[PDB]
Amino acid sequence: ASEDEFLRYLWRDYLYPKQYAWVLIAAYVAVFVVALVGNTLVCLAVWRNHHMRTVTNYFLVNLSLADVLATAICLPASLLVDITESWLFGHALCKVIPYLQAVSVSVAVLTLSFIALDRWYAICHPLLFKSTARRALGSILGIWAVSLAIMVPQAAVMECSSVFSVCDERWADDLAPKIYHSCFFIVTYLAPLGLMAMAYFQIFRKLWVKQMRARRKTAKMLMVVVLVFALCYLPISVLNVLKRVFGMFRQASDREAVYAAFTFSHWLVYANSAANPIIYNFLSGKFREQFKAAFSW
């Protein structure tokens, strides 16, 4: 008789959760394999092709290294947490994995910043600072040094406490998380991305002669990369400011809605690592050639 009520309960209790888990696991697995393969191909492309060993491509290889760190270590953990909302990797990985995720984000945004800086001095203010690949290696090492150092507090606050275990930041007072997460948002997101936007805007005014055509191609590619980065990282950055600085989502009226929003934001962060190699494949003929050689083999 009441078949419609039975169908509604079947959708809520079985059909919807099953489809939700399927889409979640499929999106994560697809991003995982695509990111691993494409970033490994970025590194292989610049290692086999000596003519692609430019300062920009060296920084892009570093960006692929940071994306591979995130994708290989943190992505499976983020997937399992978005599934169970609990921590199953133990007290030590509770510090290590979030630490490596934050270090990956810092290396990513600092690498994009240094690419924007190299392009801005090369195009807008030439002949002030020499930019060489060998100095790019030192800039990359310093990027990793700074990133590993400044994310130590992130590791220090992580704790894995019994409830099943939960891994989360532990704060002795209400003010410290607000100050720290304000600084985290401004340093890893807003400030570098706003400065990169102003730099690339000046580069666009300057560029728009074989060198100018090659520079237009590479600058269009780098602008796309920065834009997709800002888009992929906006949701999680805003949600963490709202949670940690404004105290939102403490209520559990629709706890599943908060879980879905945070889950999609985590997945967007991991999707950026899969996106970047595809961007090089469509906006760089040289990367596209090396990727074609990889797929043919």
Ligand SMILES: CCCCCCCC/C=C\CCCCCCCC(=O)O[C@H](COC(=O)CCCCCCCCCCCCCCC)COP(=O)(O)OC[C@@H](O)CO
């Ligand atoms: C995290 C720390 C580590 C970062 C790592 C380093 C990152 C390195 C990246 C890039 C460096 C290159 C920067 C490029 C130089 C900056 C580019 C620039 O000068 O833009 C100016 C315009 O600004 C303006 O209106 C005034 C600026 C208004 C800014 C409002 C938004 C602020 C937030 C945004 C971030 C602020 C951060 C500040 C940190 C000190 C000049 O305009 P222009 O004459 O051409 O035409 C005028 C026309 O726009 C009038 O409408």
Ligand SMILES: O=S(=O)(c1ccccc1)N1CCCC12CCN(c1nc3ccccc3o1)CC2
């Ligand atoms: O919202 S974040 O996720 C974030 C991430 C990226 C950009 C912006 C914000 N976030 C806010 C600041 C400190 C941090 C805490 C949690 N960390 C983490 N826990 C993790 C648990 C499992 C796997 C990876 C993990 O990474 C990563 C860094």
Ligand SMILES: CCCCCCCCS[C@@H]1O[C@H](CO)[C@@H](O)[C@H](O)[C@H]1O
């Ligand atoms: C991999 C993660 C999959 C979980 C997706 C969450 C979907 C929750 S629907 C959930 O179904 C329950 C009965 O099963 C009801 O009691 C709840 O009221 C209703 O909200």
Ligand SMILES: CCCCCCCCS[C@@H]1O[C@H](CO)[C@@H](O)[C@H](O)[C@H]1O
């Ligand atoms: C917030 C981050 C601001 C960073 C400003 C400094 C940029 C690093 S320059 C780079 O430093 C390396 C250190 O190892 C040297 O080896 C290289 O020769 C040199 O090119």
Ligand SMILES: CCCCCCCCS[C@@H]1O[C@H](CO)[C@@H](O)[C@H](O)[C@H]1O
């Ligand atoms: C870019 C990828 C970032 C991944 C972020 C993982 C979020 C973990 S936060 C913390 O995780 C606990 C499980 O340990 C949950 O029970 C809590 O509800 C939640 O607050």
Ligand SMILES: CCCCCCCCS[C@@H]1O[C@H](CO)[C@@H](O)[C@H](O)[C@H]1O
């Ligand atoms: C660099 C340091 C920056 C600290 C920023 C603190 C911002 C104020 S939080 C404030 O707390 C209220 C308590 O009632 C909440 O109701 C509001 O949602 C929220 O606006």
Ligand code: NA
């Ligand atoms: Na990324």
